[PDB]
Design a protein around this ligand. Structure first.
Ligand code: XDI
Ligand code: XDI
Ligand code: NA
Ligand code: NA
Lengths: 116, 116, 116, 116
């Protein structure tokens, strides 16, 4: 998978299930173009967002809809979303896992980047 | 001080000094309007961004220019910047501290929301 | 796997490979008895520490040897290790993934707990 | 103040108040000898643990009684406590702040090590 997202709930010690994720790519005119979206599975993972061909060089924004997740669980959280912005593939194709750990007033995010 | 930002460096175990921070407020047309900005001090803190009168309820984005910070230290970073997007709510406590802990491929952020 | 450990390097954006991990279980006399040990693979994962039969109720300490990891990479870090202490299996068997994210002066740790 | 501890709650976005903190120093026989202790204040901070004269180089353990904190708030926690084990080094800066961010199934810790 060239781009995978994994999300964990720090209150429950579980995968964060059914979290909406939107990926954007910065366009030539500096706007954020919709690139891919999906929602995390029962494992907290989102696979299948893109393909090697379509995941070209660029600046990407992964927007994890944390508010919609907490509100569905009946919780009022602090953040609107968690947003990971990075340049991808600029020295050739890489595989990226974007991981996030969610609490109502906090989040942590990291990237695992590998060369196939 | 209704809004403060504090930034640490997890690689050096030190405040993150001279990091640019931009705060935006979401406008009615969903665009991000500049609201306040500054650079973190020797203590990693940015005070004086706004006033009680100016800081009304709404959605704010705090963008921390982490890429330039790491580059100035000679370290290769993953993110373009760190973003913190949140709603200010008058129903809650009245002082917001946005804290961030920076590593080259990760970051953590939390909100400390208190009343004097 | 009843107990798995995963470790990630926040400076490199990679698995943390060849990290030594020692698990202890608190004995009747309140000392920490050696329970299992191993080291993370190329994927940053440590499987095979224990079995369902041998992983009984108790208070466990997972000690991740972060200093030895950083020093092997030629880095002087702050912590001696990262230490995760928790009661396991006290309402019947569970599966535990202990995750850690390492920086030279920081670390983060979370648990994914599932019921088989 | 050569050693300070600050603790936040990631669920409430607030200092972690009245959390017990115990500091130990490693003795020659590898046992942990009590060194200092206290409870975090209304600001989540614990000052006055030691003095420059008492705080010599060595290995220290800071144990934060997170389980009791969460229980007092009616929240089910994973960890027995959070531990931070580190070496004090005179070669480095002279003031240590040990910071921790608490969630029920996770915690993060960092060191802010500075000179006056
Ligand atoms: C170690 C890593 C990167 C991870 C990567 C993959 Br892929 C996984 O499947 C799992 Br479970 C963990 C991780 C992620 C988050 Br979220 C954390 O809060 C912490 Br601490 C560590
Ligand atoms: C920036 C830093 C190190 C911090 C240091 C001091 Br001293 C403070 O008073 C505050 Br308020 C924040 C911090 C600490 C934690 Br615990 C975090 O989860 C994150 Br994110 C950042
Ligand atoms: Na290139
Ligand atoms: Na029981």
């Amino acid at each position: 998978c060239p781009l995978m997202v994994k999300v964990l709930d720090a209150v429950r010690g579980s995968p964060a299930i059914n979290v909406a994720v939107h990926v954007f790519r910065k366009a030539a005119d500096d706007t954020w173009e919709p690139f891919a979206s999906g929602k995390t599975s029962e494992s907290g993972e989102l696979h299948g967002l893109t393909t090697e061909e379509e995941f070209v060089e660029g600046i990407y924004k992964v927007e994890i809809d944390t508010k919609s997740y907490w509100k569905a669980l009946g919780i009022s959280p602090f953040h609107e979303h968690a947003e990971v912005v990075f340049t991808a593939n600029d020295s050739g194709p890489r595989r990226y896992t974007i991981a996030a750990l969610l609490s109502p007033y906090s989040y942590s995010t990291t990237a695992v980047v590998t060369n196939p």
